[model samples]
Target: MPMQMFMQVYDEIQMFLLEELELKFDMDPNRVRYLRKMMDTTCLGGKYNRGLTVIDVAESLLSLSDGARRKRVLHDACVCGWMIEFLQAHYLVEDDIMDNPDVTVQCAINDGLLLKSWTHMMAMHFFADRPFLQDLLCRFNRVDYTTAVGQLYDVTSMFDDFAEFTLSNYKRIVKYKTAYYTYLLPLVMGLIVSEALPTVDMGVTEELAMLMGEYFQVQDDVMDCFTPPERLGKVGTDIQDAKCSWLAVTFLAKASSAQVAEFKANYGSGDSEKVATVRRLYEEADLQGDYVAYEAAVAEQVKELIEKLRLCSPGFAASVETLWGKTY
Candidate 1:
């Protein structure tokens, strides 16, 4: 179902972009063709977690018996997913540009083009009552701005010369960078589209989402250090990149003076030996054990949250659990 929905959105986005390009730039057929290809290769290439979440949550929220009504809701949800995927792709491209200052002007132009496409798509799909649409626009803008600020903090939080990796600061980064878009936005959007928005307690849902997001990122940090490149299909660069990862922060908190000296000496170096040294320190500190305990705690908290909610759907609980169950 997720794949079918993704392809539906993909085809529709392609058609929409093609018409948009032809209407806006009639003289540049070759350019438009290349742009179309780029969109297919870039924006359409992901696990589709963000896209699928929208549909999954929508299905969970609306138990409609009318087939046509369910179809319409699903279609809108798919469109929402595509918009989010585009926004995510845009952020990634922009982030890459920031990380590598030598990135070309074309990438920056593509960023602008993505934001414009997003605006155009939203205008076409969400042209209904003014207040609801206006509220969505406000939420969209707030999420985008919040995410950008989070990205800024993520990049700047790296230990340049001398910086501490506190757990508090690490949580701040995870909450902003991962929570808002990954969990909260999709869930909220799903509820809104399914006309189930009024049933949600924003405070409860947002808290649960934030907790799950933090756990997701923590697992990512642990996997980056422990999982092999063959398994992940890419080398873990968290340590090399000087990322304020959960493991790194936890290590700093628990390390002895000697261990801390060894870590500081080897941390952030691209050399494999130095990276191994840091990993050894993490193992010695039993960060994996700590992570296991943390995961259990988070799982319990999630259960509690679901139980406390006035109208928590099984579909919503399942979606959150699926995320919590990821091993790598």
Candidate 2:
């Protein structure tokens, strides 16, 4: 029932997200079609974890409120959830161009820009009358810069032929690129909507969310190399793209020099056999076993973080338990 309620909000807002532009603003019909198709094909789908977390946290935080006030907060949280989904859509439109080069880059960039522009537009539509709108918009802007800086770290490191593949760089990329917006933004958004911003230890919450985000990203890095295209729903190109993935850094640090030489010969070279060679090397290195050990450590760390906090303890613990239980 809650899932149904959440999706209803998605369906409701999408009407305004397109209709207002297509007719009210007099945007050309064909352009509207492109935008609609792009969103349908890309943005509207995918795992809505970040978008939905805000609603879950906000619901938990507002548990004590009376019916009317609770409904208002839930609506706000739901609206903001869609906002993050829109924001994530924008990020994906841009990221795909960087990760997969076959797209019409010029057209796709504007499509992403349109997606971002509408996040603010829709936020103003929903939250403009509220007092907390200023804080919400500022937080959105801050997250944008943080994530972009992370993408900068990622793009520059990968394209730089001479840069060392170190765990330090991988850590920076994971912290900024993967963790902040994905984890901390939604957590704080829940706090913002709940008006619980000042009640908790902000520093502790921020650190915990970032750590959780790092754990999630590390799993993604592992899965990219190991998971199948059919299972993953997309081809993995971490090796071909020379990504500073968690897997690459880990293998580089642990494997013998000759194995490293073997990796150097194959990685980023755009050969299927070379990619296969690298994959074999990874299996020989027992990287999957290594990931399990890392997962154990992260699980304990997450448990530790949840225990240290008194506020939102139940919701936070539940949120992480669901995340920890995920196999894909």
Candidate 3:
């Protein structure tokens, strides 16, 4: 179903951009080639967790609601859901491009910029007549802004003045950067498109989404450090990047005086030897054991939230999966 929506949206947008919108440069085959390649590289064949949740939440909300269903409701749900993937792909392209910062690589951002505009352009086309279309788009805009702000948080002070790292600060950064877009945005978008926001407890759902997003990011932070680069297909860069990740924050809390000095010396260097030094330090501190305890504690808190959510909206709770126990 998602694949169907993805193809339809891609084909429809290709036509609309080429024939109707008619950008002078878009007149060339190259534009289509670049756009097509961008989607191929960045969009498809990835986790559709956010996109699928939009559909799942809409389905659950629709099943629970009192009103007669909207026309082509399933279509709307799928399109709305896939748009989240489109939104996600836009970010991934720009993020990779931004990190590289090579001038030749920088030109790719024209495509990145189009990914942003095109993701919404497709949404506007699909939801033009729907109830609260602007409202839905507003949420989309807010999340795009939120995710960027979160990326700003995610980046190491590697770009500008270095800042102090702390666990409390890490959680705040995680909430804005990962939690909101990954969790809150998807659920809220689901609620709006299904028009179930009127019935649902927004406060409860938002809180739960925030909790899960932070937990989810913690998992990513740990995985980057612990999972082999060959297995994960991306080398972990948190220590090198000086990212305010969960592992870094926890290490700060637990490290001894010399351990702190040793970490401070080696943490932000790009040198493989220095990087491995920090990794070894992390192991000596038994950060993995710390993580296991942390995971169990977060699991309990998340379980409590979900159980409470089940009383209010079982489908929303059901939309979340058992991800906390995962080590990879």
Candidate 4:
């Protein structure tokens, strides 16, 4: 049943892309087909937990009393889910272009397409007559702007020397760049459209989101350092990029003076040997053990927070677990 519901939403998103591209650009059939392929590859390619969260939350908030009204609410929630996916795709395409200027111009055009798609979805789902439409717009724009600022902080922090890496700085970057979009936005949208917005305790939601986001990024950092590049489908360059990763900051805090010197000499270079040396230092400091403990602690905290809220459905809790279940 769940899978069928998701596919119904997915089909609508594809149709939305096809019609919007054809009508907005007045593109030839072949060109529209090409753009739709790109959208399918990038936007619909993820595990789609972000999109699914909207539907799941709506299910929890809305009663199943009226069959027709329930169907309509679910359909609208699914549309909002695709809207989140479109926003994410826009960010990914633009971030790639910013990182590598040599990327094709098509990427820029696709970014614009994604924005238009999101705007179209918003209008379709939250028409101007809706009382909360303006508030939704404000919240979406605020989260988007906050995410951009977070990305700026992240890229800039990557250039700073090892001494500049700090736990506080890493938290700031994750909270801004990842937490808002990944956790807060979908929850907010689900609550609003379900007419259950007033029931949320924003304070609790914000805290939980921050913790989950931090845990998510910390896992990414661990994977970048520990997982094989081929497995990840991208070269792990956190060490070479001088990233303000959780591992880097934690290692700095725990390393001895001599180990710190070794790290300073070898940390940010792209040479295989330099990277290996830093990895060795990380092992010597038992970062893997620390990471295990940290993961356990964060997972426990998140479970407790969800339990305390007493509003999260079994499906939502399971989704949260799956997110943290990724190998570190």
Q: Tell me the spans in candidate 1 whose CA falls farther than 4 Å from its real position.
A: 25-27, 64-68, 98-112, 119-131, 159-164, 310-328
Q: 107-129, model 2: which lDDT tens digit per residue?
A: 77887898889789888987878
Which segments of model 2 are wrong by more than 4 Å?
22-24, 28-37, 99-107, 159-163, 231-233, 311-328
Estimate the Cα RMSD of every predicted model relative to the unseen true structure: 2.9, 2.9, 3.2, 3.2
Better candidate by lDDT, 2 or 3: 2
Instruction: Give the residue spans of candidate 4 off by over 4 A.
Output: 20-25, 63-65, 98-103, 106-129, 231-233, 311-328
For model 3, what is the alpha-carbon lDDT of residue 190? 74
Ranking by lDDT: 2, 4, 1, 3
Q: On TM-score, who's better, 2 or 4?
A: 2
**Which TM-score value belongs to model 4?**
0.87
Candidate 1 residue 110 Cα shift, in angstroms, is: 2.4
The estimated TM-scores of all candidates read 0.88, 0.88, 0.87, 0.87
Worst 10 residues of 2 by lDDT: 319-328
Give lDDT tens digits, candidate 1, residues 1-328. Answer: 5788679767876777677768865838887777777676668768888778888877776653266768777877887787778788777666666554534677666765665466546546544542456666677668877888888778888645536488778888888887898888887777767877766678878988888888788888888888989876667899898889988888888899899899989988899999999999999899888999987888788778876663555556655555445422
Q: How many residue pairs clash in each candidate?
A: 0, 0, 0, 0
Put down candidate 4 lDDT per residue, 96-137, tens digits, no spaces: 666645356766766656654665565554454667677777
Candidate of highest lDDT: 2
Q: How displaced is residue 95 in candidate 3, in Å?
A: 1.6
Can you tell me which runs of candidate 3 are displaced by over 4 Å? 1-19, 22-26, 66-71, 101-106, 156-163, 321-328
Over the full model, what C-alpha lDDT does candidate 4 score relative to the true structure?
0.76
The superposed Cα distance between candidate 3 and the true structure at residue 76, in angstroms, equals 1.5
